[PDB]
Amino acid sequence: QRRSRSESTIESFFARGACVAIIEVDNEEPAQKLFAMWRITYKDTVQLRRKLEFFTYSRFDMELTFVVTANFTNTNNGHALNQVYQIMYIPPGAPTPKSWDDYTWQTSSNPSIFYTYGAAPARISVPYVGLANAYSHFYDGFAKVPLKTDANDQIGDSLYSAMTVDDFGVLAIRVVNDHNPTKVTSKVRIYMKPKHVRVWCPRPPRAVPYYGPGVDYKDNLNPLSEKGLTTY
Amino acid sequence: GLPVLNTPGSNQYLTSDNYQSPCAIPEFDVTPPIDIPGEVKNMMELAEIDTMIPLNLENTKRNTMDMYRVTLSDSADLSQPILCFSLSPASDPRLSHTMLGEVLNYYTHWAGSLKFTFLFCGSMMATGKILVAYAPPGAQPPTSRKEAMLGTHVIWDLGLQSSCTMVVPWISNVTYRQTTQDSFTEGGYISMFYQTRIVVPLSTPKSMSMLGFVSACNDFSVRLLRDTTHISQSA
Amino acid sequence: GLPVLNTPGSNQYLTSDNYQSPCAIPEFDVTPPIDIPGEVKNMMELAEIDTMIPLNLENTKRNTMDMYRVTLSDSADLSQPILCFSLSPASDPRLSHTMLGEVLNYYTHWAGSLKFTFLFCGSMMATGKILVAYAPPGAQPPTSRKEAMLGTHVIWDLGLQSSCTMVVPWISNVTYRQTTQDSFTEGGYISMFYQTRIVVPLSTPKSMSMLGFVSACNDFSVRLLRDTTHISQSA
Amino acid sequence: FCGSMMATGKILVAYAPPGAQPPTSRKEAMLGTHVIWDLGLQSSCTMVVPWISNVTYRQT
Amino acid sequence: VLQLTIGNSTITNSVVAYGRWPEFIQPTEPDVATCRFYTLDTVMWGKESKGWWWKLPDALRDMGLFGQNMYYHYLGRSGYTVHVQCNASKFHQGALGVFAIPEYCLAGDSDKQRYTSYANANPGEKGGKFYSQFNRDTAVTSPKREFCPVDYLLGCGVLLGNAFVYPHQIINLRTNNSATIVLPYVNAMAIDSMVKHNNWGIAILPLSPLDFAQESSVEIPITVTIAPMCSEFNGLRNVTAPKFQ
Ligand SMILES: CCCCCCCCCCCCC/C=C/[C@H](O)[C@H](N)CO
């Protein structure tokens, strides 16, 4: 035995940064997208989702990297000075911005990153922030149980396999700069890298296209292709 | 000189970072500290302090001094509860604005046992028994004494002791609960009932008021600092 | 301060780099782990697990429960093969979507011995011998028992043992084969033939079904992680 | 069991201590003491009824 | 193979899921009232049967004192011992795959996502049944809000063939007539609510179709017997009464 399995380890399997979200933030004269709130999850994309759903439970420290790409929108010769983007983390319960100049942007206790355009992509790390002892990719249950004494069925009605409505909060991204006379549109791509990963209860990989945050399937349910029984 | 490689994240300002910075006033002779009474080393020390609960939040009683008083009486309906509130120490209106709740609303997660102290402020000639019950979540919220009896509970004799301490132990599926209304991290319910009655003699007030206080125990802990929703600024 | 020289590559984001980054939530009391059953330390552990093979992929049988069943019978033509498939554990349709193939399709290179377990699911009154053969690449794919005989092979008596393990050892010119169809890293062929026949008595089903399972051995290894082609997202 | 060697089956033999309804269904007899007996494997099954009584001696 | 005695119930290869035996972590532990084999309602395996599925501990919600403890207490944990019995003659042929899936989330029948109701998601001891194809619900006015498992997709968008990654046992009528799986407590928490969360899912699939001699229609019984093991509950309060309709 001289061939090794260093690259098949769980840490190596997730050691790549996967894009999990693309957020559009526009700066223009203040129906608008001057600030964008994105709920944190890996299920907006399939690749990392499929890799993680190889297992039932996980525990990993995350690393987020933000790549910002700005462009003009129908500019004739209108130009702009280098922009600064504010990415504020809003955990469940904290107030959420209602405008791009709201008081919530003060970031007194909410962590925030101020990224200057043209610099290196903004990278930070997060520890395991799970309420339980491990993350639950699959939850075979509800959060509310409808009881006999409930006045109406909606009291106990809950989404299947949904644990909490506000899983880990949102990221609110704005352009701190005031509006230039010409519109500037930017895309922030968030790349998520698990680290120190531990996994439990392996599961078969998804074989059909994802349909929503659950195991629901709707279309393209015939994956295997035609092949002769005795054809090599 | 020394070859270096600029890693991603360079030239960013993270408000939670811990980096050394140049001093704008070097060689400054700072005033030495003194032993001022009341030094605080942790924020949970404040939460451990009992503070009165706005138990009554009716339209004509909230945002007054009557919102801290719960009326007890000998003429009350012994079948109905005295007071009832969910065990949400940061989202429940009766607990959110308490000192404990104020400290919690700066954090996303909380875990620990609570302590509710109920003080009877009637006459010394008034006597009675009160059943104070905590029901862990999962079942119907106790609407009767026969139900609240089945959960954790304590009987409080008004004549003997004017204050009762109902300790709610930490019993949770998750290691930490959220400081926001969530049916998955629901904490339970707290209810109060008349065990026997309030009995008063003649020439005594037949209606009295009780006060409620809430505190955190030494096992209490919070996690993931955040911004409170209580304070806002017009922009 | 310290003179430094910015080397090429500065201010780049390589998604496979391993650099330290600032913590956005410092002094966070992470929930401690517990001993959850089923911990996985390597992805090849999953590949070592035997999983059923969609051996039959006809137009009217694929993407159903009939694609895992291969029909055996006493009336079958003893000269023709039962099943035949190339030893491509990541590109062959019958092996690509197996757990082994799913793990391989995340890597560019693979090397190791395979293990095919064939299970007979007929009556206990049915008996027969099956010749399971592996032919290393280079020659004609065995179209007859006289040819498959010449390669590696095992005889499986249905009556005695209901399952047979055909181990395909690692025999390759290269140290690693590609997980993609390539005639230079071709792995070989697997074929099955009737050694004698299936013999059944009266009042017994004359047609039966066999199942196939594929697994990796302890010598198995993969290299050069990549993105799988199985999962796609509409953009 | 005195059938053919080609006959197979499972039999649930249950003892129910007194006090409740006499089991009229398998779902009830299941709740008391019981044993499952595979006819094909063993042709004889021994259901032992342990001594469980309020009194030290019962009347005949 | 050998005697299997738990509490007051005895059953005449057995696989331990993930190689872990059920174990304990003041939790209320009924050593006898709950540690015993409860027999579920027998199902009938035919030539046109697609499969069956049950959810644990939901299947034992009305089984003796185990259900009473489950409903009275707030949060409880329990391992299980599942025993599937299917006796057939030497002239019968077939194979059953019995899979114990942790967190066996299933797919719905409507375009709305995660819209399955609690009543339908918790069938109890009767369980449910897989289907050959995916039947989309068309009753917009009164959606059924029920699962639509697919046999070859395992009801979760994965291939049936890879389901053997889960703890499994194959009842092949030619060699064995019973299967036994010992499941420990598997969850992200040391203890969790049982009324709202199901820890395990038992799926029985006819890998090879049933057949007997040259008979057109043949059906044989399958009986599932589940023994809670090392079950402990905590958070005693008034009884929970779920709305099953
Ligand atoms: C500006 C600073 C940014 C701070 C960002 C903190 C966000 C915290 C989110 C951490 C975990 C998100 C992703 C991991 C959880 C998975 O979705 C689990 N499987 C949950 O089901």
UniProtKB/TrEMBL annotation, chain A:
Coiled coil regions, renumbered to chain: none
Cellular localisation: Host cytoplasm; Virion
Domain Picornavirus capsid: 1-146
The organism's place on the tree of life at top rank: Viruses
Binding site for glutathione: 101, 106, 174, 189
Free-text function comment from the UniProt entry: Lies on the inner surface of the capsid shell. After binding to the host receptor, the capsid undergoes conformational changes. Capsid protein VP4 is released, Capsid protein VP1 N-terminus is externalized, and together, they shape a pore in the host membrane through which the viral genome is translocated into the host cell cytoplasm. Component of immature procapsids, which is cleaved into capsid proteins VP4 and VP2 after maturation. Allows the capsid to remain inactive before the maturation step.
Subunit structure as annotated in this protein's UniProt entry: Interacts with capsid protein VP1 and capsid protein VP3 to form heterotrimeric protomers.
Family label: Belongs to the picornaviruses polyprotein family.
Protein's name according to its UniProt entry: Genome polyprotein
Source organism per UniProt: Poliovirus 3
Location of this fragment in the whole protein: 644 to 878 of 878
